[PDB]
Amino acid sequence: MLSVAARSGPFAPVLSATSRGVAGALRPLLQGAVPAASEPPVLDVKRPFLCRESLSGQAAARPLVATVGLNVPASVRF
Amino acid sequence: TATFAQALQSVPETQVSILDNGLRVASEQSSHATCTVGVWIDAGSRYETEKNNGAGYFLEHLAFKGTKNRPGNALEKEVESIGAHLNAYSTREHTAYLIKALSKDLPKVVELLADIVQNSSLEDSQIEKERDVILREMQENDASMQNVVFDYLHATAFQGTPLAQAVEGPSENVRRLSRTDLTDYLNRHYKAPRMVLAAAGGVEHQQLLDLAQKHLSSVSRVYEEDAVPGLTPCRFTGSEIRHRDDALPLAHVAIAVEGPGWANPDNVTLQVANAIIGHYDCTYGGGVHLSSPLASVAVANKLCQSFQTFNISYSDTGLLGAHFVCDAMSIDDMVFFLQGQWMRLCTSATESEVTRGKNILRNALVSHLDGTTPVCEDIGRSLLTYGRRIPLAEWESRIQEVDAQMLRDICSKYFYDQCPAVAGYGPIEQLPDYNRIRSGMFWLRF
Amino acid sequence: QPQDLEFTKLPNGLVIASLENYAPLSRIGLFVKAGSRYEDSNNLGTSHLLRLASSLTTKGASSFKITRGIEAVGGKLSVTATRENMAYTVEGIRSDIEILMEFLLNVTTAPEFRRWEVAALRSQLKIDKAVAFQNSQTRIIENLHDVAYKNALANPLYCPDYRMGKITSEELHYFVQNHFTSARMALVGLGVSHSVLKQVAEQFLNMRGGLGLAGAKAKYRGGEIREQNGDNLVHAAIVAESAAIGNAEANAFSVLQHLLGAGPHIKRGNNTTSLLSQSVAKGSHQPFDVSAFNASYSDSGLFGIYTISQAAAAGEVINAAYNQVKAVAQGNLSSADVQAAKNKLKAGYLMSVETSEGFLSEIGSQALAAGSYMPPSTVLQQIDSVADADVVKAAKKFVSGKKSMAASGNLGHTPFLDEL
Amino acid sequence: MLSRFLGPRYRELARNWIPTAGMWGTVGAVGLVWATDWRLILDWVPYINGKF
Amino acid sequence: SKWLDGFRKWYYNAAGFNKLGLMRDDTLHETEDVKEAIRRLPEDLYNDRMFRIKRALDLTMRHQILPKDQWTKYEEDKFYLEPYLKEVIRERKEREEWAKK
């Protein structure tokens, strides 16, 4: 009894994925549609670490402490 | 070798016989070790009389909850004890109870089917809990938004007729319906002349006839008041319904016109027309090279989330049209594009387009009947609607009659200068008024 | 009536299976052992883009030619990828099928893989992943696979979100030239003569004679993942290591999942002969859905329970299902239940190959695994050759193994793996 | 440089659009002779020959 | 013959886009086929072409040309746009001949 997807009765279409490159005559039931979701906020390019001298101190040693403010920038310190 | 016509005539023939009760027993045989046996009853929402508007649905629920000789889950246990699958559905015109099983257990399943259509034990506690279950799944089917637009389109197209009401009916009828009303519905509409016993797969026709004579003998056969419930033609209404809820992310719009029904041959031609326009959703992997003009336009302009054409047939009536889901900003544009496609089929259909639609319809008709469940569905629905099983070679002969001139004549007969029925649900204020949609259904250049 | 199935093993390792049944339309499928099993940490999601690359330009046909030529004859091209193998299936009316075959030939042998087309396709794979993860069972099964295995089966069916916009044509070309070789493929034709398939295979399946790259050897780790998403329902899959395919223990585990309940048989049913549903329905007075999960691969297997329950009553449902499996792991079961489980399993197998798609998928997997036909009656007698002690020792092997748990929803009352 | 429309489909479109374009030309000719009060055609018609 | 090659390089000097540092493929008018071939270019060829066009625009703004030792010459005028453009017209001709029938 091969066909590993049909080994599982109800878990046939969950273990498998069936794309259709050229969609045929019969339409599939539950066509489906993505909702128009949101977008993530944009952020600046960060600091890469390409040397041992820049990486020093980046390893965390203390618990995470966050700080917000009315007119000071938000920060997180480890 | 073997061409298309020889393979189409090599398909085995469906044998139909009539019992003394008027029960129509039909079957067809293949090499399969399984079987699909079902009972199709000519009873739906069209026969309900606005006060028992969910009677067929509520019997369709209670049919599997126990009979007189098999009280409750023991019946259920029996079918699980043979590993068979039991399914049902209820339309506006037809009700079906079908079982997939093995062929080697053909007798017992027929016996089960027998009491399911004639010996159902309707208990008050089961009535209460299935009333709650039906309320739960009307709440569930309110989320299936294309079903909501389907119901809205039927209501606004068949206003004032028994074909507007849904199969599950209103909520108050679910809250108030009593066992006597269900008994009246089952005594009126579950008689033997309206039942087709269909079987598909590795089943002997004579064996099934012996089983139907043993079990399904004397189902009702008697009107008990000499009152035949006859169907009456329903008035089509060019109308618009607009359910507006801007909180939804996507909008579903269905546009329709009349189609002729089951027993008019140009349905086949109309099917070819749908095969020209076709279906699409966002996960189709063709790109900008799909053969359907509406699909390529909607891909290039990024209009749709999905669209889908339909032809829906009842007794001398039906709904022919399209249904799409998209965001708000696209809606108006797509309506224009969709109507333009229809007008192209009314005016300037070509021959390669008709040939492509014919090949699509050939593949749809053959590949739909793969397995015993859709074959059995085709048998039962064809004996209820056409009065006979139309063979696939007859379908191929009718598809071959279609050329471009008669196709655009039929499309001009059913689409051009006709008032549509429009249903909408979602952010639909960019969906135009009825005047612009109606004006888009004809060209000023012809 | 048709004749029996016909096999051919070409010298480059290609398997050819054909059934001549004079069907009105024919089905041609090529089965390749090139799933997501064969990626590693650097080319994740290559199988997802290769799944959607079935309508790109090849040599001999463009994207326009492939799409318009398959849609002009009304035929259909699809591809189905499992975590172990892919299947490219074309279908169409019989008098056209040979031209359809060469289209599939191109898609399976010489893709061009231009850069601009895959840069267009990556948005489509993001949209496809969103549509696929719209439901919760897919998300929890992919999480369960990522937790249960540490290599070669934790690779999901869908491309990860960081990799989108980063799959290049070079990774696709590397994947095709290392896994789409002729010693790992089966060409199966329903409704076509054997000489046509042999002629096409001798024409253009003579380029990659090696066995490719293989030997990934998935290992088991276990653990748990708990996706808090605050839904009203709580999904939870608890699995453990089980036997692979090629064993009588795999038959024992299939009999075990159909004994405990492996999905519905009745529309709006109560699942009365399911043991798990019986135990939870004795426990809980709220709606639920308990079933048995069994994913058997060629190297390892996962077996467990999959529960859907309410947010607050999740612990009672999960504990009742686990105690039901514990009770049937201690010999407490009836032989009539095992006989009904065997009947359910063989009825499901005979209904799976009832349609042409299930039959072609089954014979494609059989040709990929053994290269020879297993008739359905041999499968039924192998089902019938399973004792009760085999099912008992299968449940005992489940209960004594370290579990992989994936949970999704409001997990305030959902237990942890130390409390099963 | 109009060689893109040399095929059977555009000929099919052309023979589809012969009668509509001919009827639109008939409308244009009748409207032109109606608005201009042209004496060539309006003397060939029975009822309109009343003012001459 | 080689007379035609010498006459083509004389015409190359007489046309004058070599004096602005331009290639031959930079001087193509932006039709739809040309724009699609630009869209199919790799990013380094795209950046080189855009810088060449911007520098030529700057030089023609000042009514000046380059010094002669950085002029484009007839031999190293590489034809980068030719295979992309050839594939674009072949695909468009295939779509047109499909749509003709």
Side-chain angles (χ1 to χ4, degrees), chain A residues 57-66 75-78:
Chain A
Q58 279 289 297
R62 303 212 53 193
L64 188 153
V65 174
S75 82
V76 65
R77 304 161 311 310
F78 302 103

Side-chain angles (χ1 to χ4, degrees), chain B residues 409-430:
Chain B
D409 272 355
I410 285 304
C411 277
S412 59
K413 190 195 180 54
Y414 280 99
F415 279 110
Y416 196 80
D417 211 356
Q418 301 286 333
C419 313
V422 178
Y425 192 20
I428 50 154
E429 69 174 356
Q430 211 181 288

Side-chain angles (χ1 to χ4, degrees), chain B residues 29-47:
Chain B
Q29 198 171 357
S30 87
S31 65
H32 298 170
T34 70
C35 75
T36 296
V37 192
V39 174
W40 271 259
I41 317 169
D42 219 350
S45 169
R46 206 178 170 170
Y47 299 95

Side-chain angles (χ1 to χ4, degrees), chain D:
Chain D
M1 285 303 155
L2 279 74
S3 66
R4 208 176 283 157
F5 316 118
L6 277 296
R9 204 183 66 86
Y10 302 104
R11 184 177 178 179
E12 262 186 51
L13 275 170
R15 54 201 321 280
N16 265 330
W17 281 95
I18 306 313
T20 300
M23 185 179 288
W24 273 115
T26 285
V27 170
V30 165
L32 184 135
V33 74
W34 154 85
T36 50
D37 291 331
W38 200 6
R39 294 81 71 201
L40 275 189
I41 299 104
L42 279 188
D43 291 331
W44 275 329
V45 64
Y47 182 56
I48 320 293
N49 273 328
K51 65 179 72 66
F52 314 105

Side-chain angles (χ1 to χ4, degrees), chain C residues 208-362:
Chain C
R208 288 161 168 150
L211 311 93
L213 196 145
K217 190 43 203 72
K219 302 179 285 293
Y220 187 81
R221 38 166 292 199
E224 58 207 294
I225 190 167
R226 284 168 79 88
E227 187 160 77
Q228 175 92 43
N229 52 73
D231 213 335
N232 298 293
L233 293 187
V234 168
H235 302 252
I238 298 94
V239 295
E241 177 77 30
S242 77
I245 286 182
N247 295 318
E249 207 182 355
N251 312 132
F253 273 114
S254 284
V255 170
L256 180 54
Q257 68 166 353
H258 275 87
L259 172 67
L260 286 156
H265 280 91
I266 297 89
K267 199 195 191 190
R268 287 168 285 244
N270 315 336
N271 307 268
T272 318
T273 71
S274 170
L275 294 166
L276 299 169
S277 289
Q278 217 175 343
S279 55
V280 180
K282 281 164 220 303
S284 166
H285 65 116
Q286 293 179 356
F288 59 94
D289 201 282
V290 194
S291 60
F293 176 78
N294 180 46
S296 54
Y297 304 103
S298 52
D299 45 359
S300 169
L302 297 178
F303 177 77
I305 46 179
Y306 182 73
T307 66
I308 315 174
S309 60
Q310 301 305 308
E316 311 289 310
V317 172
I318 290 171
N319 288 136
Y322 191 48
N323 280 315
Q324 179 69 81
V325 184
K326 277 152 99 160
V328 309
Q330 298 154 355
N332 289 91
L333 73 165
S334 88
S335 65
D337 291 331
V338 192
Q339 207 47 242
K342 285 175 178 179
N343 298 337
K344 281 180 249 199
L345 176 61
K346 66 183 51 183
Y349 178 66
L350 284 162
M351 282 169 215
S352 74
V353 300
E354 187 191 40
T355 184
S356 76
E357 181 65 26
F359 183 55
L360 186 143
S361 176
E362 172 68 34

Side-chain angles (χ1 to χ4, degrees), chain B residues 122-351:
Chain B
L122 299 174
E123 306 299 315
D124 48 346
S125 55
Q126 275 286 347
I127 277 158
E128 289 161 334
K129 63 177 55 54
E130 282 304 305
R131 157 178 305 130
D132 284 88
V133 175
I134 290 176
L135 279 164
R136 274 169 55 197
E137 66 182 1
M138 310 185 318
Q139 185 194 0
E140 190 83 14
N141 292 326
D142 287 355
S144 180
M145 187 182 307
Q146 73 154 10
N147 296 152
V148 177
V149 185
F150 196 72
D151 278 327
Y152 284 173
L153 180 84
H154 273 86
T156 198
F158 292 122
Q159 305 173 0
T161 69
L163 183 62
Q165 45 204 16
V167 194
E168 68 275 16
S171 296
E172 293 94 1
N173 267 321
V174 178
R175 276 140 52 168
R176 81 149 172 257
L177 209 45
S178 73
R179 197 202 189 273
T180 57
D181 291 331
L182 278 297
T183 316
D184 307 328
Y185 187 83
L186 188 153
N187 291 2
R188 277 205 71 86
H189 298 111
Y190 272 27
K191 302 175 189 313
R194 320 152 78 102
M195 290 164 180
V196 186
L197 182 63
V203 286
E204 193 78 27
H205 176 68
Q206 197 53 246
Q207 169 177 354
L208 192 88
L209 203 44
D210 298 349
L211 291 170
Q213 194 49 271
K214 178 156 59 210
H215 294 300
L216 286 152
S217 180
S218 85
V219 176
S220 276
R221 178 63 269 175
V222 184
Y223 300 97
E224 309 156 357
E225 293 179 353
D226 276 321
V228 189
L231 276 192
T232 300
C234 295
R235 160 198 62 199
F236 189 78
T237 287
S239 67
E240 181 204 57
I241 180 166
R242 303 179 83 97
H243 193 176
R244 183 175 176 86
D245 193 3
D246 270 314
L248 314 178
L250 291 173
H252 293 236
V253 182
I255 315 184
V257 291
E258 290 275 79
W262 285 116
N264 189 358
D266 46 2
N267 289 318
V268 182
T269 308
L270 288 179
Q271 287 279 314
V272 183
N274 297 326
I276 282 166
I277 303 174
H279 43 84
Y280 172 86
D281 59 328
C282 61
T283 81
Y284 277 177
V288 285
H289 305 141
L290 282 72
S291 287
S292 169
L294 198 156
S296 49
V297 159
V299 160
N301 302 328
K302 293 294 170 109
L303 295 171
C304 64
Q305 266 304 313
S306 87
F307 64 91
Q308 167 192 190
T309 47
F310 52 86
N311 200 3
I312 295 163
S313 295
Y314 316 97
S315 314
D316 55 68
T317 191
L319 286 170
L320 168 67
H323 155 83
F324 48 90
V325 58
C326 55
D327 55 332
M329 295 298 103
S330 312
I331 290 176
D332 162 77
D333 270 321
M334 185 179 289
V335 174
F336 151 78
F337 279 125
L338 166 68
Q339 275 174 331
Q341 285 307 298
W342 282 340
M343 291 325 98
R344 210 179 41 84
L345 289 189
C346 294
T347 43
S348 46
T350 65
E351 280 284 334

